[PDB]
Paper text:
Import of proteins into peroxisomes depends on PEX5, [name] and PEX14. By combining biochemical methods and structural biology, we show that the C-terminal [name] domain of [name] mediates intramolecular interactions with a proximal [name] motif. The [name] domain also binds WxxxF peptide motifs in the import receptor PEX5, demonstrating evolutionary conservation of such interactions from yeast to human. Strikingly, intramolecular interaction of the [name] [name] motif regulates binding of PEX5 WxxxF/Y motifs to the [name] [name] domain.
Structures of the apo [name] domain and [name]-(GS)2-[name] were solved by X-ray crystallography at 1.8Å and 2.3Å resolution, respectively. Analysis of the structure of the [name] domain shows a network of polar contacts between the N- and C-terminal regions stabilizing the β1/β5 interaction, consistent with the extended domain boundaries observed by NMR. NMR {1H}-15N heteronuclear NOE (hetNOE) data, which report on backbone dynamics at sub nanosecond timescales, indicate that the [name] [name] fold extends beyond the typical [name] structural elements compared to the yeast [name] and other human [name] domains. A comparison of the apo [name] [name] and the complex structure show that the [name] fold is highly similar (backbone coordinate RMSD = 0.39). Interestingly, nine out of the eleven Arg and Lys residues are located at the [name] binding surface, forming a positively charged surface area, which is favorable for binding negatively charged peptides such as the C-terminal [name] motif. In contrast, the PxxP binding site located at the opposite side of the [name] domain, is mostly negatively charged. Notably, the human [name] [name] interacts with (di)aromatic peptide motifs on a surface opposite to the PxxP binding region, as has previously been reported for yeast Pex1326.
Numbering used by the authors: 264 to 341
Amino acid sequence: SINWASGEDDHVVARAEYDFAAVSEEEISFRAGDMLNLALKEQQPKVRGWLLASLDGQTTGLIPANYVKILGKRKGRK
Ligand SMILES: [Zn+2]
């Protein structure tokens, strides 16, 4: 298990431009201003137009790519 969601392993961070309420259990919710952890390219599930992300560092899921701005790669805390 690659622990990008917790930030224990290397991860990408993104800032939410808008609020988002998950309609599917595959999706996760967040608010404008939230920082989200994203899986590295290799662990991205390549669902067209979505990114695998975590807000709370435990629940991972899909978020709409144009609701966030990718800021950069971050070293795991381990
Ligand atoms: Zn981090």
